Point group: C3
Amino acid sequence: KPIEIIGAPFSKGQPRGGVEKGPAALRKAGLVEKLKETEYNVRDHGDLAFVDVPNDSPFQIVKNPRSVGKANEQLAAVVAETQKNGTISVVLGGDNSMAIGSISGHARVHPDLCVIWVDAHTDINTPLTTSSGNLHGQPVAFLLKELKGKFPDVPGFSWVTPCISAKDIVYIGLRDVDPGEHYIIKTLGIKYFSMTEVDKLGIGKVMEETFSYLLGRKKRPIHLSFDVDGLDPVFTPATGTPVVGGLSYREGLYITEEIYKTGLLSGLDIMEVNPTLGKTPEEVTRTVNTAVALTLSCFGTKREGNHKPETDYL
Amino acid sequence: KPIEIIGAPFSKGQPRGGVEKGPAALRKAGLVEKLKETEYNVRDHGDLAFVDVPNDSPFQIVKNPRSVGKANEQLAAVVAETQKNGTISVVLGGDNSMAIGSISGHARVHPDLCVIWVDAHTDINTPLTTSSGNLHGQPVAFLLKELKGKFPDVPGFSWVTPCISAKDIVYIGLRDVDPGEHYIIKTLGIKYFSMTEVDKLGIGKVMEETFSYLLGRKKRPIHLSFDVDGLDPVFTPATGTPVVGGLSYREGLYITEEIYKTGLLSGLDIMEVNPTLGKTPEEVTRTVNTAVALTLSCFGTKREGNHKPETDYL
Amino acid sequence: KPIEIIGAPFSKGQPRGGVEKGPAALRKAGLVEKLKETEYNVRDHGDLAFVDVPNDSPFQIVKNPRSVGKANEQLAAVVAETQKNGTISVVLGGDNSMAIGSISGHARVHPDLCVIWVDAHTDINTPLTTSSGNLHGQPVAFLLKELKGKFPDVPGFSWVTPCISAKDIVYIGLRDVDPGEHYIIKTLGIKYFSMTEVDKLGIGKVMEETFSYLLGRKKRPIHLSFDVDGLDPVFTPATGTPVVGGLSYREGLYITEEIYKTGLLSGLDIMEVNPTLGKTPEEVTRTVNTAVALTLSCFGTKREGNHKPETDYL
Ligand SMILES: [Mn+2]
Ligand SMILES: [Mn+2]
Ligand SMILES: [Mn+2]
């Protein structure tokens, strides 16, 4: 299948500006060029242009509900279009709120997909439980069937249709969960591997586990929503919500490497890369480079090396 | 049981001043306020005032024997009082020599306790084996029954009564043991997991192993003596004897997290935090924050998150 | 068996000068003195003097073929002399091209040896596959029987006799392999554990694996060829080709400690320590100390501690 890059330069999902420069930063680092050197046909769709909704009064505590809901509906339509044509979508964030459009779109064409959410957070706060307005912390609430109607309808999200059930999502790398979120994942019986489970089992046993939970009964396409903060701030410092005690660069690459091997990766997001949040330029390069490394790993790049078949060396 | 904070700002246990500022620094980071947010009643006893013994001539190579012995006698009495009232004592060091008073006190009330010593060192040098006078490196020698009389009586420690035998202590994180100490732990048959076993088994199997060694025959109260240098200098740099190749922040929190789950934590020490040894202020903050995080983990804080029961979110 | 230190201050194996100062740096750090404190007799043979071959025109893309070929022949002779006398040779590089002489020499006296190559790279490019002239990235191509005649005869290497077959070498720590090298290791069926396998199995299971592969059928002397870049750049930054995502200091010491326990260590190389490549002096000290620590570990130094037997402490 070919790969289609889609930039989502949107940052109204959280309080600080910056994530909109994520797509630019990743491209400037040669992400598309590097991708072209793999056994995949790469088409770069370019960055979506989001029309800013005027007089976007907060719902209640929820902020920018219309701009976010609109931007997502727009993104969902695009993602649905490429998936339709049989291509693998890669969304360059942009903050996590944009995972609503990405997974929705993807689900329109692939209704039986599962989601592997790699993050330091669950991002499952409903507009009620949220302690801030911020929508980047609420993606999964708007996507879960089991949470349908457990909160008021938000302006701009009328189009949203809960596509995944609690049995289709696995979390990896949790270490910063709110009481409400914790209550929800505990109540609904959601599967997760927080840093304490990664510490106990090892990333090898962790991936083995997630694949038999998700793919044990039957094979289905996978959507990997990757948040750069799921790794330790020492590796990906330039994000808005860094939390020490994260996954290591190695563990990061092991996750993506294992995913490639299933041959089921259908959708992928690289979110939260905030170019303006690094103390020094080296921190921006460090974050960007690991974000790219993660991407190429999903598409065949192995640490043991790679070589073009049919070519005879020697 | 309630929790009682007891500050032991003592530094005569070793050659450099500074560890006396450990309690002040931990407090300033909000250690007590944060503890209060847990499902525990927190009472802060304050910092003990130690009277300096005049003309404290070295025993032999042993330094400040009277000031260290006196200070511990004082601390042992306090710890015994609180343990007697059914509370959990938390001693904020201060150097390791103060572990003599802490464990003694705890043992007068709970004679069947076991000790889990997390440190890069065994701190088991007798006044004979020591290559320096420093008592901070001799705590366990004064507490072991099997070492009673294998060395001369030291001034200021007449009150000491060997409370634990070689089968009641487990070491975790060893990577800097002296020949003599190595001789002792090898001879006496002491159980330990140096960095090489942590590397071979993994922290999960390590904790699993210590719990069945210590609690396999019968449950008994646990005294966790935690030396901040048991973790890698990259995480807790502000100590006097850092040794590269340590336990990681995650490994540290996994230790504390497992301990909480036994529900047997009865005594806890957070030793060696020397605010004056960080090259830059960030190093002090880093050491202090991880010391605090370890403390809260012991009292319930989980990485997967926590939530107040009886409260309904949604 | 005694130990014989042999310095190979050579750097024509790669484009940058610097590795010739490796032996100097290692010695200045007290490597020989520290070695003398082990249960081994240490003789320091000193540094080899290499005569520079005039008018050393590039073979094809291959650079300095004569200087490197000669230097190795000289080193092979010395190594064979000490091996003959029943000693364990320790070669202090110097770049990896000097592994050609080291292993060859050792193989003349011990034709049944196996090689454990710890490195970020396979260093198996033939003069054809190389994308640069650099011989430091070609050692193994000149030593494998299975690659004999798969490339033109290079000037200065006529004396070389392929000594090890594809079943006698195991790689550990791979994370930067070229397409050709990857083609070769995949084709010839060479056993390896790249970073991804280390991540999956853990270093304990990895060493257990290499020992049964290599020593399962019958015991034979081991040649440990250790390249300082097999550890992460955070521990050994002063090398020419650093690659993030490496083995940790702990993982490093576990390798060496396991090798000592076999009692089969017959030859050892400590290569690539480039004193002139550290940003700050602390980076040089860091690289050098871990190289030293690795060496002592091979010769008995344990993390749990060591003590002289027959001596009674207490
Ligand atoms: Mn996140
Ligand atoms: Mn210590
Ligand atoms: Mn290398």
